Each structure stands twice: as structure tokens, then as C-alpha cells.
């Protein structure tokens, strides 16, 4: 890895199908905001999944990891004061085969205790909060990124922590 980190923060819900992308980090400091690549809040088009998470680092740099090709990017949701420290994922439960457990939405906790809920899909439930640390990078697991709107979905995400 280029930037050094002390640990990885993960959550227990969230899919297992897809390929992990490249690990991206803020050049300096931590991230204090995020945006999402989601499909416009319209009706008819069957529900699918998030196609990406993108963080803003207090040093104006923006990072994402592996992104899907569908949906549009929302404006950023920024920390009132600190930086991001913990995240929770919204996902439906599954079964043996149909592992419908892609990530539907995400909410973060900032260092000042503010909670920022992404404006995503609202199907499923928020699972437990990951542990807390100073978020400086991320890595995304996306199923068929270049695929059809059909099975392209961000399945999981993990963030890296810095000193």
C-alpha cells in the first residue's frame, strides 16, 4: 500500500459476491464526507443497488474505489465538524442462494457525533455500526461493475484507519 494505516473497519451485513477494487486513500488526513452513485428516486424501474461510495477528504481530494456504471452521484453530505469515524450499512437479509444482500444505503458517524444518512435505497435494515477510527481510505466490493443495470451492485465496503 502507499499510505500507511493502522487497521480496517468493516461491518457484518453486506454481500460477498463481486470483486474487491483498489484500495484508495486521502493523500493526507481523513475523509469528512461522502457521496453515492444511486439511481434517481423515480418509480417503475425495478429497485437495484448502490453503484458507488465516494469520500471527500478535508484536503479537497476525492476518492472512490471500484464503481458501477449505473446511477448518478448525489451531492456530498459533509461532517459538521470532524471527520468520519464509523459507518452502518442498510441491507435486506437473504437466504441460501439468493443472497440479496447488496448495500442499499450507508450512514456515517462523524467525530463530533453527528450522524449523516446517505440518500439511498430504503429497502432492508441498518446493521450494527462498525468500530470507530479515523477514516482515511476505502475499498469497495462491486458485483459486475461494467455489467447491466441488472446485477451490478456494490456488495461490501471497508475503510482503512490512520494515526
Swiss-Prot record:
Which cysteines does the record link by disulfide bonds? 26-57, 79-110, 133-161, 136-162
The cross-references to InterPro entries, in alphabetical order and at most eight, read: VOMI (IPR005515), VOMI_sf (IPR036706)
Q: Which Gene3D superfamilies match?
A: Vitelline membrane outer layer protein I (VOMI)
Please tell me where this protein is predominantly located.
Answer: secreted
Question: Would the keyword Disulfide bond be found if you checked this record's keyword annotation?
Answer: yes
Where does it localize?
A: Secreted
| A GO cellular component entry from the record | extracellular space
Q: Which UniProt keywords apply?
A: Disulfide bond, Secreted, Signal
Q: What does this protein do?
A: Exact function not known, component of the outer membrane of the vitelline layer of the egg. Seems to be able to synthesize N-acetylchito-oligosaccharides (n=14-15) from hexasaccharides of N-acetylglucosamine in a manner similar to the transferase activity of lysozyme.
Stated family: Belongs to the VMO1 family.
Q: What is this protein called?
A: Vitelline membrane outer layer protein 1
Question: What is the organism of origin for this protein?
Answer: Gallus gallus
Amino acid at each position: 500500500r502507499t499510505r500507511e494505516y493502522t487497521s480496517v473497519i468493516t461491518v457484518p451485513n453486506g454481500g460477498h459476491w463481486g470483486k474487491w477494487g483498489i484500495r484508495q486513500f486521502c493523500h493526507s488526513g481523513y475523509a469528512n464526507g461522502f457521496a453515492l452513485k444511486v439511481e434517481p428516486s423515480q418509480f417503475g424501474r425495478d429497485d437495484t443497488a448502490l453503484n458507488g461510495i465516494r469520500l471527500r477528504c478535508l484536503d479537497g481530494s476525492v476518492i472512490e474505489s471500484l464503481v458501477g456504471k449505473w446511477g448518478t452521484w448525489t451531492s456530498f453530505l459533509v461532517c459538521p465538524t470532524g471527520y468520519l469515524v464509523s459507518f452502518s450499512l442498510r441491507s435486506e437479509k437473504s437466504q441460501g442462494g439468493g443472497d440479496d444482500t447488496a448495500a442499499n444505503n450507508i450512514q456515517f458517524r462523524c467525530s463530533d457525533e453527528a450522524v449523516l444518512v446517505g440518500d439511498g435505497l430504503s429497502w432492508g435494515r441498518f446493521g450494527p455500526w462498525s468500530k470507530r477510527c479515523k477514516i482515511c481510505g476505502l475499498q469497495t466490493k462491486v458485483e459486475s461493475p461494467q455489467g447491466l443495470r441488472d446485477d451490478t451492485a456494490l456488495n461490501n465496503v471497508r475503510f482503512f484507519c490512520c494515526k
